[PDB]
Amino acid sequence: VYADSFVIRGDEVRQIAPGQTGKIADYNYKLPDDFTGCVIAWNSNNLDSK
Amino acid sequence: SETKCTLKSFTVEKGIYQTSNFRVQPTESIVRFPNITNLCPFGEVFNATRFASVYAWNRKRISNCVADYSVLYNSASFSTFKCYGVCPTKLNDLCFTNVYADSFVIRGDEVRQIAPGQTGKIADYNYKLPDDFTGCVIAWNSNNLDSKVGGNYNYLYRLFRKSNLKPFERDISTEIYQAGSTPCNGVEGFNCYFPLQSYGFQPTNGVGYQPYRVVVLSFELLHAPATVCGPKKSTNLVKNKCVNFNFNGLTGTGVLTESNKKFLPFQQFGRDIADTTDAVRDPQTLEILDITPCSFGGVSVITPGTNTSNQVAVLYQDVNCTTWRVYSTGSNVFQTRAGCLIGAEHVNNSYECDIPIGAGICASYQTSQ
Amino acid sequence: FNGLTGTGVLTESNKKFLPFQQFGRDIADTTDAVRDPQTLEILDITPCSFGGVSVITPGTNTSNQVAVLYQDVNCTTWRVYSTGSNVFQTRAGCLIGAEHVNNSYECDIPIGAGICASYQTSQ
């Protein structure tokens, strides 16, 4: 069991999934097509914005 | 060993076993795409000053370009992107034929309707996408472009219609809709309605009421000459060898040779009796090539029991032995009517049959055996 | 009927449905009866198609005349494709498009139930 963690823009959340393309899926964080696990995300506008 | 694995045993009894087929591997790959040098009009499709009303959407033809989607990475951000044909990770390995980009502006809550199987004002009266669909639907928020403080009323949608639209139809007429029994001869009274309404797009609207720009990219794959290709680099064409290949997105393994087939001008691929591609027209030189599978077959093994010795002879049914498509020459080559037998001595003494091979020939283990 | 679609021939039925039953079914769980939504009449549903068709063919390298046998037609609208003006009723079906002769012969193309056919003479 491992927990990967990072911050991205809301429109890019859709890329953290098997089979996706885009800046994150292709160059920053590629999740495999064969994947067991859960992807969880939440808004942090009041924490990570200035 | 192949026989041992097939039989799930570490011991093999005396006799003949079949052992798959003689196969060869490809040594290099060939990639052939038409030499299209222009980049697709991503700017015009996605960076347009104005988009059409959903009731009267645009349909632009795209051809003779390279679909390098990465040009959008430092500019656009999309909230929605979904492909109903190809998995997005493979778009760059393919070529496309009848490629069109439909475009319009709708409210955010209506974005969910641009999909197969949906209902609602857009899906039923403005833009119906077919149940059988190949393409990708892409959309993004345009609140800072398409909204005005007093309301941007330049975007219209159809609210009233008598029946639902069929796929990709447009209806831009402005007849008065009759809801009741009244003839509605330009009346627009209690039971008569003008069919179109504007969206009040304002910068302070909540998200579901903000405008979204929608682009639908329709396409067809692998059955016609390419006009649009992804950004793959081509290679040289290698003939008369077992190779891997990609011809306009169609991949496979085989031996490419010159063909005497003539294709009609609109035919890109040809097929055999089992509907398997067996010929292609090369994308840069319009030469027809035939494709023959690399593998062929006819292999079996003559085995003394393994509890006696590990010497075996191998029969190649489709090899004449007068590179023979054999695993080893073996220095003991006997051609029979049943195949080329390698690894057995040929003697002139006839005997009672022991391990039958075929076509009048048998084998045995005999004497220094 | 209330969202349940299909194709068939609707006829009056002698079935009685319990008050809570809207549809009835056969041994293959296929609806075979409905209660009409406005008039509470029970209707039976019979499939439109039925069957029994075969073609008697002289080789096509000789002629294109054929005769058609209808196994489930008595011919005495007959549920046939054409009357043909040459109608012979046999125990194997209604044979349309063949002449009936009183000369017995050795069997050539067997039809069934003692009847055979052949192509013979202006043939």
Add this chain to the structure above:
Amino acid sequence: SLSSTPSALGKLQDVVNQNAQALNTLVKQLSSNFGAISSVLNDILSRLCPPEAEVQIDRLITGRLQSLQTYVTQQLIRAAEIRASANLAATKMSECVL
């Protein structure tokens, strides 16, 4: 008589036709999609990724195995009929010839 009437040997011609048609059938049956988007494995693989591609490939694998099982069953049935004929022929050789 044998020269004049070719049908005399229909019994032997029939076993070389039937066991040839059987293989031509297996090749032709490869064109069926068996519920898949395409009968060609390469189209499935060039357009789809594993989470979906494996479903389409499995539809074809199951269908092709079914075709092969059908073939084998028919050949086993035919083989039994041939054996019976061969046993009769062997009996006649002993009782009519020897």
Add this chain to the structure above:
Amino acid sequence: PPEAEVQIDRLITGRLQSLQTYVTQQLIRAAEIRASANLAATKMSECVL
């Protein structure tokens, strides 16, 4: 269609399987009947004629 065709295909495959089962059983039975018929034919020649 995107879903309906899956459900329809499940039924088509199942019905073809039922028909293949039927045909295979009839072929096996037919072989047994033929053997009986050959015996009967033999007896007609050897017991009656």
Add this chain to the structure above:
Amino acid sequence: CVNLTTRTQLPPAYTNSFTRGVYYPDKVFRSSVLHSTQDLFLPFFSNVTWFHAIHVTKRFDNPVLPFNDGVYFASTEKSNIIRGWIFGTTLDSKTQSLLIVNNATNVVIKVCEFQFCNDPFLGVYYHKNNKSWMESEFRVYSSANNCTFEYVSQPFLMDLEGKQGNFKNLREFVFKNIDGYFKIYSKHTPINLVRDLPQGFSALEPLVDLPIGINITRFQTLLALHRSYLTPGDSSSGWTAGAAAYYVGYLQPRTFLLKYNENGTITDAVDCALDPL
């Protein structure tokens, strides 16, 4: 627009479609093979309506016909009289419709909220001076608002000369309107006929696939008129019907067994629903 007069009253003729109406159903090459396929095809030996233009009993047929989900159209010509078609629903400026014409210089395809003429036509005037046949009138529509599709071919010069003798050119087309696309298949075959359609077999090849997006329920055929020094100067009666004919059939879902020869040409076909044989 002009309302034409001086036409006699005749019943429609009917003919036998025989084995016409097959088109290549794919864009894949295959050869020396029989292939079974299902599509909308003209049924074999179907009832084809025969329309005719002839001066003589003056006849000039340009009726509105139903489209019925797919149309087989064919014509026999000696002198380029059939010029085009109108496809749509009401054809009265309320909805969009498709106009496909050959105006002797360009092939023009437009989709607009056209208001069509009751008797749409094109025409050619014969100048006895210098013996010339020239394109003159073009009626067809009174208005064309809110155009969404437009194409014009490169220029060409069509031969507008009137001709004597038999028909020399057989043109066949198949029109379909599926999922927003107007598909056209076609073939041009040399002929030598006095009347009616020839028997024989030829498959049509795809020509265009137009991204139109409109509803087509009816269509109308556009014929050219001939005018000359020999006719009255009145625009409704001052005309010649020339000599041309066309045939209209309708497509139905059918299964065909198509025969491809060694070079991948369809040479024959079986209509699987024609009869038990």
Add this chain to the structure above:
Amino acid sequence: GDCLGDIAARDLICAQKFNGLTVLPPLLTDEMIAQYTSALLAGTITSGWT
């Protein structure tokens, strides 16, 4: 018309026909078999085994 009329019977023969299952007649009818059997007996009785 016999299967359509007599619904109540729930005749298995009609159920089979409506589902495409067809039973075909034999070429030799019982009357023809009877003639062959009678011929064999006449032969056996008047010209036994010849």
Add this chain to the structure above:
Amino acid sequence: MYICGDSTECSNLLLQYGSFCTQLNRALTGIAVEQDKNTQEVFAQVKQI
């Protein structure tokens, strides 16, 4: 009739399996023919009535 029951959508989907239906009937036809042959082998040995 067995598989689709005259449903049009099924009939079109079933086209891809048409080669299997043809094979099923070739087998049944072969059985049906043998049944008449069996009858003749047993009862039609003497052609003099």
Add this chain to the structure above:
Amino acid sequence: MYICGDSTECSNLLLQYGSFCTQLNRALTGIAVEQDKNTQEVFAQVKQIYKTPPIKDFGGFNFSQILPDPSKPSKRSPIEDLLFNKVTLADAGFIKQY
């Protein structure tokens, strides 16, 4: 080859069905073996290969159409040669090269 056609991804997926492929070939092998057994049961009943004597009279009985014809490349009787030229086989040898 029948199922995957050398597609690598299919070949790996097909591994789960390997026990079915093995079973199909055991059945086919069993048939193939029986075919040679049938031939021997019918024709190899006598293991003494008796030579036809130089022809001497048989009392007027002429067996030349059943006895092998020595002038032929294959020692078949006139009748056998006729039988061989009437039944037509699918191929004419067992070697077909790539």
